[PDB]
């Protein structure tokens, strides 16, 4: 494949987000700030920022149907943004009720509901209610025993898959009265009240992302044991016709994204992203898409020498610091679509501690 | 500092100050010394008269050693009978000094020099026997063994003047033979003593200092002389150190420094110890920065953009 460095982040980013036109993109960094960017012509400029949070913001995304932005930080509170017609954009908390730091928010396909992930054993499902202006949070606290680590919608927008820290894998019913209409029959199930415990699969590990495929029909999560499992439900009440686990040697995968109906992209402490191809027959490690093991007379100008004199000084060695290959250089956060419409991806973006937000081209 | 020095400094500095002083001043200062010698300094019936007492625990085995009349003919008229809870005390009264300053000098130095003067005692007495059994000797070389075993049994002395420290010596024809029975308490102190100690004895092997008195060591067990020796455990966990003092090593003109140089031996091991401790500190912090300099790595090129001096940038540009 090949990759494009978009920007290199002062600070650790944990998540980005881009617009339904891929204008500009919004991430997060390690404090309590929230930064905006858009191009420069060939290159990415700074926005704005929002300091309406107090603590650590963990997850910020972007809704590209209605270009609104929501942030869930440490500071157990919620903030929704939209743009103002003049160009600026308007605050409003949402009331989450938690009792701890939320850890991973995400827009409905919809984006009429966004449910949020958090430590408080618990998870806040919150909508719009028109005839009040108001925001309202519901619990989803029946099967739940741990931390959330990650959460997925379903196209159906009904189910949500929870990835729970509790090494097992959680897929509930999000689906609420005044909002949704009546979903059509599923594999997962038909009769899906709000709260009900469509599918528990167990893990060798926190399962750090989960993941429906984009037929809607199927799962896969990843544990810290540095495993993808692919689930292929049969019915409800049924154990699922086949338990596809492949098994890598390298770091924990940290998120996963489904390429197309057969294929899952998914990235983790390894500095790289992967490629999964198979059916329902099984699946197996395709290709290194970071290009494996690259390792990739004259004046000396001042700041060269001056460097090379605080190296020497500093230290014994004098030498390049690091020359890391891959081109990454720290743990990624995630992956999300760039463009191409459902189920035909062929370009995804990517961000990390290292701060790069480095787009994949297939 | 490397050698440990012979006197008190602290009565030498008072009496230099008080000699040459105009106006006097009544003080009361006890003052304790190594090896648990204590000196109490008071001004009890004169402003102008100033007492000086002495303190050790083996003084009674001085006195049976002959050192009264040694202490008498050292210093002079200026005995004094001894105050309650000391030893040896010496009454001076300024109105009565040499006028000359050399002579205030050396009686100064002479006063504060107190601890050898009166340790030294047992040393002299080993050396008039040497000497007469030196000339003995000479009278008739075939008369020699006899006469050094029977020196070796009658005049064998000892003093216990530390309950871990003893000094035994004995004279001869020829030599003054002296034992120490070294033994550190505060484990680490042992510890680092056994390093001192090997490293001590190897020291007069080396050609390079030939000349100095032979040394013999030998811990787990005493010499033969002084096993029957009471006072001397069967080697528990007592070093036995042993200076061979030839005659050339006391020469006339070399006795005093001898002796004071043997008494001071282990406090000068015991101050050296703490020094060698002391070096450990410094060269270890010294390159546990080495360490720091080896991790200052992993950490990427960063600007600090003024932080001129004893404040913030100082300016807004």
Request: proline content about 5%; glycine content about 4%; overall charge neutral.
């Amino acid at each position: 494949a090949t990759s494009q460095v978009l920007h290199i982040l002062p600070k650790p980013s944990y998540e980005h987000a881009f617009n339904s036109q891929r204008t500009e993109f919004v991430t997060t960094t390690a404090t309590n700030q929230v930064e905006l960017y858009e191009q420069d012509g060939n290159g990415w400029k700074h926005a704005r920022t929002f300091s309406d949070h107090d603590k650590i913001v963990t997850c910020v995304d972007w809704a590209p149907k209605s270009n609104r932005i929501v942030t869930c930080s440490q500071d157990r509170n919620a903030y929704v943004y939209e743009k103002r017609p003049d160009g600026t954009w308007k605050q409003t908390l949402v009331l989450l009720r938690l009792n701890r730091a939320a850890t991973f928010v995400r827009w409905s396909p919809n984006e009429d509901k966004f449910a949020v992930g958090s430590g408080a054993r618990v998870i806040s499902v919150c909508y719009f209610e028109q005839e009040n202006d108001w925001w309202v949070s519901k619990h989803l606290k029946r099967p739940l025993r741990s931390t959330i680590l990650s959460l997925d919608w379903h196209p159906n927008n009904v189910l949500l898959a929870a990835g729970c820290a509790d090494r097992k894998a959680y897929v509930l019913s999000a689906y609420v009265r005044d909002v949704d209409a009546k979903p059509e029959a599923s594999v997962w199930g038909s009769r899906l009240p709000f709260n009900t415990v469509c599918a528990e699969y167990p893990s060798g590990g926190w399962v750090h992302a989960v993941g429906f495929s984009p037929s809607g029909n199927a799962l896969a999560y990843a544990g810290h044991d540095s495993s993808v499992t692919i689930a292929y439900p049969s019915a409800p009440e049924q154990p699922p016709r086949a338990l596809i686990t492949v098994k890598l040697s390298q770091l924990p995968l940290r998120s996963l994204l489904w390429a197309n109906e057969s294929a899952i992209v998914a990235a983790g402490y390894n500095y790289s992203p992967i490629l999964l191809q198979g059916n329902e027959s099984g699946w197996a490690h395709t290709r290194d898409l970071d290009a494996g093991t690259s390792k990739t007379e004259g004046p000396v100008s001042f700041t060269a020498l001056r460097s090379t004199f605080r190296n020497m000084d500093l230290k014994g060695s004098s030498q390049s610091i690091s020359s890391l290959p891959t081109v990454h250089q720290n743990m990624i956060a995630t992956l999300r679509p760039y463009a191409g419409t459902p189920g035909n991806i062929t370009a995804f973006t990517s961000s990390g501690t290292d701060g790069r937000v480095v787009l994949w081209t297939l | 500092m490397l050698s440990l020095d012979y006197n008190n400094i602290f009565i030498y500095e008072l009496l230099t100050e008080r000699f040459s002083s105009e106006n006097p001043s009544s003080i009361d200062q006890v003052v304790t010394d190594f090896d648990g010698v204590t000196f109490h300094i008071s001004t009890p019936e004169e402003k102008t008269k100033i007492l000086i007492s002495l303190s050790m625990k083996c003084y009674p085995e001085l006195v049976n050693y002959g050192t009264l009349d040694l202490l008498k003919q050292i210093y002079g008229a200026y005995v004094h009978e001894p105050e309650m809870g000391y030893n040896f005390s010496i009454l001076i009264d300024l109105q009565q000094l040499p006028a000359t300053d050399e002579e205030k000098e050396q009686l100064a130095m002479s006063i504060s020099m107190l601890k050898r003067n009166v340790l030294a005692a047992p040393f002299h007495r080993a050396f008039t026997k040497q000497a007469e059994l030196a000339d003995l000797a000479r009278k008739d070389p075939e008369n020699a063994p006899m006469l050094d075993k029977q020196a070796t049994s009658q005049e064998l002395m000892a003093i216990h003047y530390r309950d871990e420290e003893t000094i035994v010596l004995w004279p001869e024809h020829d030599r003054v033979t002296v034992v120490f029975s070294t033994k550190f308490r505060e484990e680490t102190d042992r510890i680092f003593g056994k390093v001192f100690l090997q490293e001590f004895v190897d020291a007069r092997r080396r050609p390079a200092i030939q000349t100095a008195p032979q040394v013999l060591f030998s811990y787990r067990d005493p010499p033969l002389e002084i096993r029957d020796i009471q006072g001397i455990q069967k080697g528990d966990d007592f070093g036995f150190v042993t200076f061979v003092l030839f005659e050339r090593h006391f020469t006339p003109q070399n006795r005093e420094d001898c002796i004071s140089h043997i008494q001071v031996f282990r406090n000068t091991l015991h101050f050296h110890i703490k020094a060698s401790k002391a070096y450990m500190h410094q060269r270890m912090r010294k390159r546990v920065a080495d360490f720091q300099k080896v991790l200052n790595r992993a950490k990427p090129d960063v600007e600090l953009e003024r932080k001129t001096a004893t404040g913030r940038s100082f300016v807004r540009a």
